[PDB]
C-alpha cells in the first residue's frame, strides 16, 4: 500500500537526515574547538610586551613556554611560531623533554600555512597533509599574530587528522566524509578508508540533488538511499540499503 | 494485549532512531568528561615538572605556578583554574577577572570541600558531579587532582569548566533528549522548556526505575501517553522521550 511505503520512507528520511546532522556537527565542533584554542594562543602571545617579542632569545624564552603549555593542554602534535627571517620557534610532541628551539631549515615562506595566514585576517585551516616527519596526516591551523598592527609572526598548530576520523567513526549511521578532491577521508565503516573503492554513484546522486536532499541510487544493481551535505571543504554523506522501505 | 503497532517494521526503526539519538547525548557527556580529564592531567604534569624549589614557598608558587594556571585556563576557556594548599590558601586564576595574575587567597574553606578532600584519596582525577551552586547561581563542573612533587603533596589542582558548554552541547543534539544531575534535577535539554523547575519529571524517572538502561517504557504526564528511555552516564541520567502519537501517528487525531 502506497501509504505504508510512504510512512517508511518519510521515517527513514528523517532518521538518516538526523544522523547526517550529527556527523556535520562533529566536523563543525572539531574545527571550532581548534580555532578557539588557536585564537587564545594568539591573544596570549600578542599580550606579551614588545620587549619580550623583538629578540630571538626573548621569543625562545618567553613564547616558548606558552607554546609548550598550549601544546600539552590539547595534546597537539606541534605548536610553532614562524618569523619573517624564516626561523620557526617549534614545540613538538616528538621532542617533549627539550625546550622549544628556533629552527632555520623548515622553508616556511613556501608553505601554505605561513603564506595563507598573511593573506587573511582569519585563522587559515590547511587541507589534511602528510607530515613525512611524523608519518601522519595532519590538519594545521595558522594565524598571523599582530600586536598593535605590527606583525609578530605566524602561529601554527598541528592536529592529527586521525582525531577527526576517530570522532566520525564513533557517530551513529553509515556516515563518511570526502575531502576537497572527492577522496574518502573519514568513515564510520573503517573498510571505506581505501582509495580503491569508487563512489561515483553517490557523488553523482549528490550532484543532482544538492545539500541535505535524500536520494536513491544503485550499488550492484540494488537500491540504496542517501544524502550528502557540504561541511566546510568536506562533503559529508550517509547511505543505507533501501530494504527498509522495500521489505 | 500487545499493541499491534509494536510488531511493525516502522515501530522497530522508530525505536532504533530513538536509541541512536539517546546514545548521541550519551556520547556528548562522555566526550566532554574525557576531554576535561585529559586537560587536567596535562596541567598537573606541567605543574609537577617545575623544579622542587619552585614549588616549596608561597612566593615561588605564585610566580611559577600562576602563569601555568592562566595559560591553561585560556587554552580551553575554563571558568576557574586553581591550586589549593594545605594551609587552606588557594592560588586562583579566574575568567571573571583576566587582567591580573593569579593571587593567593586564604578565602575559600577548601580543606572541607569534596574537590579537595576526594582528590587526596585517589591516584587520578576526581570528577565532582555537576551541582547547582546557590550563591554563584549556576551549575559547576569541577575536575581535581592531587599534585605531588617527588612524592610529596604540594596541593590539589582544581578546574571548573563552564556548565553552559555541556548544556548547550546537549541542547543542540537531535531528538528530545535531556540530562538530569545526580540529585535527579534537570540539568540540560534540547527542549529548553524542560529546564523549568515546575516541570514534573517524576513520571519519566519512576518509569525508568522499573526498566533499566536504554529500555523503552510507556509513561503518562498530564494525560498524554509518551514513550521514553533513560540510561546512566556517570553521575548523570540521560533520557529521550516522545509522544505516543508521534511514535505511532494516528490516522485520526484526538
Amino acid at each position: 500500500d502506497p501509504f505504508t511505503k510512504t510512512s517508511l520512507y518519510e521515517s527513514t528520511l528523517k532518521n538518516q537526515t538526523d544522523l547526517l546532522k550529527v556527523t556535520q556537527s562533529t566536523v563543525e565542533d572539531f574545527r571550532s574547538t581548534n580555532q578557539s584554542f588557536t585564537r587564545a594562543l594568539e591573544k596570549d602571545i600578542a599580550n606579551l610586551p614588545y620587549q619580550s617579542l623583538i629578540t630571538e632569545e626573548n621569543i625562545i624564552n618567553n613564547v616558548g613556554p606558552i607554546l609548550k603549555y598550549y601544546r600539552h593542554s590539547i595534546n597537539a602534535l606541534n605548536v610553532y611560531l614562524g618569523l619573517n627571517n624564516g626561523k620557526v620557534l617549534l614545540s613538538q610532541k616528538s621532542n617533549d623533554a627539550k625546550m622549544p628551539e628556533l629552527r632555520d631549515d623548515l622553508d616556511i615562506k613556501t608553505k601554505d600555512w605561513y603564506q595563507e595566514a598573511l593573506k587573511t585576517n582569519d585563522i587559515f585551516v590547511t587541507p589534511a597533509y602528510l607530515d613525512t616527519v611524523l608519518k601522519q596526516y595532519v590538519i594545521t591551523y595558522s594565524k598571523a599574530i599582530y600586536k598593535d598592527g605590527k606583525i609578530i609572526g605566524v602561529l601554527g598548530v598541528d592536529i592529527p587528522s586521525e582525531d577527526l576520523q576517530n570522532l566520525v567513526a564513533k557517530t551513529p549511521g553509515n556516515t563518511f566524509l570526502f575531502d576537497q578532491k572527492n577522496k574518502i577521508f573519514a568513515a564510520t565503516n573503517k573498510e571505506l578508508l581505501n582509495p580503491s573503492i569508487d563512489h561515483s554513484p553517490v557523488l553523482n546522486a549528490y550532484k543532482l540533488n544538492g545539500d541535505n536532499n535524500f536520494f536513491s541510487y544503485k550499488l550492484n544493481n540494488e537500491e540504496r538511499l542517501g544524502a550528502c551535505t557540504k561541511v566546510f571543504a568536506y562533503t559529508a554523506c550517509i547511505t543505507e540499503s533501501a530494504d527498509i522501505i522495500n521489505k
Side-chain angles (χ1 to χ4, degrees), chain A residues 1-97 99-247:
Chain A
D1 199 299
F3 178 89
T4 297
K5 188 176 185 182
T6 295
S7 75
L8 293 174
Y9 177 79
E10 294 189 2
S11 176
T12 195
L13 184 150
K14 181 210 175 195
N15 167 242
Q16 295 294 282
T17 292
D18 281 346
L19 299 188
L20 185 53
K21 285 194 175 194
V22 172
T23 287
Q24 167 172 352
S25 290
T26 298
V27 175
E28 290 176 342
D29 294 347
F30 176 81
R31 181 165 290 195
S32 65
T33 290
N34 291 331
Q35 289 168 318
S36 293
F37 170 89
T38 301
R39 172 158 290 111
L41 182 46
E42 164 187 43
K43 189 179 180 180
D44 262 323
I45 293 168
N47 180 64
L48 292 171
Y50 274 99
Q51 192 56 46
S52 301
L53 300 170
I54 62 179
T55 79
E56 290 161 291
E57 188 71 14
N58 286 1
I59 282 278
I60 293 165
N61 293 328
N62 293 286
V63 173
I66 309 182
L67 304 182
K68 179 185 57 173
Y69 300 141
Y70 271 75
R71 174 172 62 79
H72 287 159
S73 74
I74 204 165
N75 190 37
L77 292 169
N78 298 295
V79 178
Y80 49 91
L81 180 62
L83 310 176
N84 186 50
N85 68 1
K87 296 188 190 180
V88 172
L89 183 61
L90 180 61
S91 181
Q92 38 178 184
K93 186 181 185 187
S94 67
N95 292 323
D96 186 53
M99 53 162 81
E101 81 181 353
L102 275 176
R103 297 278 296 274
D104 63 11
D105 62 323
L106 295 175
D107 204 38
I108 73 184
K109 289 185 169 180
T110 69
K111 301 311 191 299
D112 284 335
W113 72 262
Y114 189 88
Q115 295 176 323
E116 293 302 324
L118 298 177
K119 283 136 81 168
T120 179
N121 291 314
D122 271 325
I123 298 164
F124 178 73
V125 186
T126 68
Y129 61 95
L130 289 179
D131 226 39
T132 58
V133 180
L134 292 176
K135 122 167 282 289
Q136 192 156 6
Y137 292 132
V138 171
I139 293 166
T140 296
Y141 303 81
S142 61
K143 186 63 161 72
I145 303 182
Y146 300 88
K147 182 178 183 69
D148 300 346
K150 198 86 174 165
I151 181 75
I152 306 308
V154 176
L155 178 63
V157 176
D158 294 348
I159 305 295
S161 58
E162 193 166 7
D163 285 355
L164 176 54
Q165 150 62 20
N166 288 344
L167 283 165
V168 169
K170 298 178 171 189
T171 61
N174 181 47
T175 58
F176 52 94
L177 297 185
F178 294 104
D179 69 21
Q180 276 175 347
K181 304 312 223 203
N182 289 344
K183 317 297 222 176
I184 191 74
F185 174 78
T188 301
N189 186 345
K190 81 182 199 219
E191 293 176 21
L192 283 173
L193 298 176
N194 188 349
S196 64
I197 299 162
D198 179 70
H199 301 277
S200 293
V202 176
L203 292 168
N204 285 337
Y206 170 49
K207 186 70 187 163
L208 291 177
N209 288 280
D211 284 347
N212 294 314
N213 293 331
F214 210 55
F215 56 70
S216 179
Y217 75 97
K218 284 184 179 183
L219 172 71
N220 192 33
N221 302 121
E222 297 295 310
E223 192 189 7
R224 293 185 65 84
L225 308 169
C228 307
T229 190
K230 184 183 184 291
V231 186
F232 310 124
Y234 298 112
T235 299
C237 298
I238 191 168
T239 74
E240 67 179 353
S241 169
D243 285 352
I244 189 165
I245 72 174
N246 288 324
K247 303 302 182 184

